Design a protein around this ligand. Structure first.
Ligand SMILES: OC[C@H]1O[C@H](O)[C@H](O)[C@@H](O)[C@H]1O
Ligand SMILES: OC[C@H]1O[C@H](O)[C@H](O)[C@@H](O)[C@H]1O
Ligand code: NI
Lengths: 346, 339
C-alpha cells in the first residue's frame, strides 16, 4: 500500500508497506528517508515532522550533495579551471554548501510496480548555485520491494563540466532508541584501508592507511564498542568514527557491510568505492528524536560515495562530471532477520 | 474556509473561501495564484494541476524573479562590476533565467486571521544561482480577506549586494474563458508615459515616451479594442501591448488601474512605480485552459514592479539590493461587484 499526507511546511510524507508488513517512509524535503520500521521498531533515526529537520538537524536521512563531505577550502579544479564553492564550514565546503539540496522541496512521482514501489524525486541545481557549474538535472529514486530491499538510485546530467558525488545520509540505530548507543551492534565491513583526517577541521590528512589488525579492522565481525573504546589517535581525534573506508572489492554484487543486532541485520550493497562512517559523535548535544535525547554514538551512517579528499588524494577517484555525461550511482540496504547468531551483552 | 490538497508532483493547492463566498487558490509551486472565482466563474487564467504549468506555460500566476522582465544581454552592473546572468531568451535574461523561482516548490505556512487568511511562501536562492549574488532569503505572502482584497507582500534579504525586482504574473480575463478576447474589457490606468521597445527582441528602446492623447492613454476609462486596433507602431510591433507604463503618482493608497467587464471590476494598488501590461499576444499558440483554447489577447497582466530597462535608462529607477538591506513590496488586487 502507498499512502501520502502533508508532513509540514508544504512537504509530503510518502509511506510504503510491503507484502511482509515492513513499512518505510520518505519526504520530498531533501529526497530523504524519514523512517523504517519492523514490528513497531525504528531501524533508523528520524523526526516526526519537517520543521524538526529544519530546526534540529537537516542531514539525517537526506540526500546530500552535489558533493558529499568536505572540500578543503571549497576549492575544486574543473577542466583546468579553479572554482571556489560556497564555504559553509570555516573555509571548507561541507555537503555542497549552505542551504543545499537537503533543504529543498523536490518534486516527485510515485510508480507502483507491484512487488516494488518507486519514489522518484527531482530537482534542478541551477548553473552557479553555491559556485557549482550547471545546470544540473538531478533525480533520486527511492524504492522498496517485497524482499525488504531499500534501493537508492541517483541520476544526473549537467549542461557544463562540473563535479558530482552525492550520498544518502541515513543513520541506523537498531536499538530503535536514539538514547541507546550503537556500541552493542555488530559490524562487518570489507575494507582494509582508511583515510585519516588531518585534525579537528576534518579535512583529509593526505595519506591512506592500512587498518588491518587494529581496532578499526571490521573484516571479521566485531562489536562497535571495540572501536569506541579505542585510543588510536584517529579515534580520539573525532571521539568515535568519522572516516572514509576504502572498499577492498568493488561491485554492486558484494555485501560490503553488515550491521547486526540480535536477530536483525542490515546489509549494505553499492557501486561506489567507499563508505563514509560517522557515529554521531555529538557528545552531550542530545538532539531529541521522538522525545528521546540522542546519546553520543546513538547512530551510524554508511554513506556510500567516492571518498572525500580526492582533491588532495587523487588516488581516491575523480568526481568530475562532463557536460552531457550521465551520472549514475546505486546503493542498497537490505534487511534480514536471523542472518546470523548475535547474542551479546554490554 | 481553507482547503489543502495535493496539486500533483508533490505540490499543494491552498484554497481560501471568504465570508462572501469568493474562492481564491494558490500553489507552492512558484508561490502562485491558480484560480480566482465568483459565482463559479473564473476571473483569471490558470490550470488544473501542477503538471500543466510545467508542461504548458510556467509563468501564469507566478512569482517571477529575482528580476522580472528582460535584461539586455543578461548584463547587470553590481558595485561597479559587470555580472552576466543566465540567458534564456537569446542573449537576454527573461524572468530570472532558466528554471527560475517560478519553477521551484516553496515551503509555506498558513495563518488564519479570521477575516483574513495569509499564506506565507519562502525560498532561498543560493549565492551564485543563475548568476545572481546571494544568498537571498525571499518570502511572498499572499493574502485574501472578507473584503475581496487579494494582497501580495514581498520581503527579501541578501548576504551580498545584488539585484531584486520580482513581480506577480497573474493574467486576468473577466470573460472567465481563455477562448474569449479581453478586447471587450474597459481599462483605466493612471499613467501618462510609457517605455517603448526597441524591436522584436523586446529590449527597451532607450527612451521614455509621453502617451497623453494617444491610443494608449487610459487615464480615462476606455475599451481595449481601441488600443488593439491602433496603428501606433509600438502596438503594431507586438500585436497588442507588452510594455511598462509609468505611474503618475506613487503610493499604495491610490487606485492605479482598473479593469472592468459589465458588473465586475478589478482595482490595482501598488507601491511600485510601474505596471507592465502584456495582453497575451500569442497569436495562434492556443494554449489550453480548462480545455478552452487560448486566443491571442485572451488575457492581460498587471505586473507591478520597477520598469524593466533601468540598465539602459537609469531614470527608471534602481533595482539594486545592498547586503543586509530588507527589500519590501506590496501589490493589491481588489474585487468589486456593482449593484
Ligand atoms: O552532521 C553532518 C556529519 O556529516 C558527515 O557525517 C560528516 O563527516 C560528519 O563529520 C558530520 O559533519
Ligand atoms: O509569458 C511571458 C511573458 O512575460 C512578460 O509579460 C513579457 O513582457 C511578455 O513578452 C512575455 O515574455
Ligand atoms: Ni502535499
Amino acid at each position: 500500500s502507498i499512502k501520502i499526507r502533508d508532513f509540514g511546511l508544504g512537504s509530503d510524507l510518502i509511506s510504503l508497506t510491503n507484502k511482509a508488513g515492513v513499512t518505510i517512509s520518505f519526504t520530498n524535503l531533501g529526497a530523504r528517508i524519514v523512517d523504517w520500521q519492523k514490528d513497531g521498531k525504528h531501524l533508523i533515526l528520524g523526526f516526526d515532522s519537517a520543521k524538526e529537520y529544519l530546526e534540529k538537524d537537516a542531514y539525517p536521512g537526506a540526500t546530500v550533495g552535489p558533493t558529499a563531505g568536505r572540500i578543503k577550502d571549497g576549492l575544486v579544479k574543473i577542466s583546468g579551471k579553479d572554482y571556489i564553492l560556497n564555504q559553509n564550514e570555516g573555509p571548507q565546503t561541507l555537503h555542497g554548501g549552505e542551504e543545499s539540496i537537503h533543504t529543498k522541496l523536490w518534486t516527485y512521482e510515485v510508480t507502483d510496480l507491484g512487488a516494488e514501489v518507486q519514489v522518484k524525486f527531482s530537482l534542478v541545481s541551477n548553473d552557479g548555485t553555491n559556485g557549482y557549474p550547471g545546470k544540473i538535472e538531478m533525480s533520486v529514486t527511492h524504492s522498496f520491494d517485497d524482499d525488504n530491499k531499500w534501493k537508492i538510485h541517483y541520476e544526473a546530467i549537467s549542461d557544463k563540466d562540473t563535479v558530482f558525488n552525492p550520498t544518502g545520509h541515513v543513520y541506523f540505530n537498531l536499538n530503535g532508541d536514539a538514547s541507546e548507543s550503537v556500541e552493542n551492534h555488530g559490524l562487518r565491513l570489507a575494507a582494509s584501508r582508511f583515510v585519516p583526517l588531518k585534525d579537528q577541521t576534518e579535512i583529509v590528512r593526505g595519506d591512506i592507511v592500512d587498518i588491518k589488525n587494529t581496532d578499526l579492522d571490521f573484516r571479521q565481525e566485531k562489536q562497535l564498542s571495540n572501536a569506541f573504546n579505542s585510543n588510536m589517535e584517529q579515534v580520539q581525534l573525532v571521539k568515535g568514527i568519522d572516516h572514509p573506508f576504502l572498499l577492498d572489492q568493488l561491485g554492486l554484487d558484494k555485501e560490503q557491510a553488515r550491521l547486526t543486532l540480535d536477530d536483525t541485520s542490515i546489509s549494505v550493497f553499492t557501486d561506489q568505492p567507499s563508505i563514509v562512517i560517522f557515529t554521531a559523535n555529538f557528545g552531550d548535544l542530545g538532539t531529541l528524536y521522538h522525545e528521546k535525547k540522542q546519546v553520543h554514538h546513538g547512530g551510524i551512517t554508511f554513506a556510500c560515495q567516492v571518498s572525500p579528499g580526492s582533491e588532495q588524494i587523487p588516488e581516491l577517484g575523480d568526481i568530475s562530471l562532463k557536460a552531457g555525461e550521465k551520472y549514475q550511482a546505486t546503493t542498497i540496504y537490505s534487511l534480514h532477520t536471523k542472518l546470523e547468531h548475535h547474542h551479546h551483552h554490554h
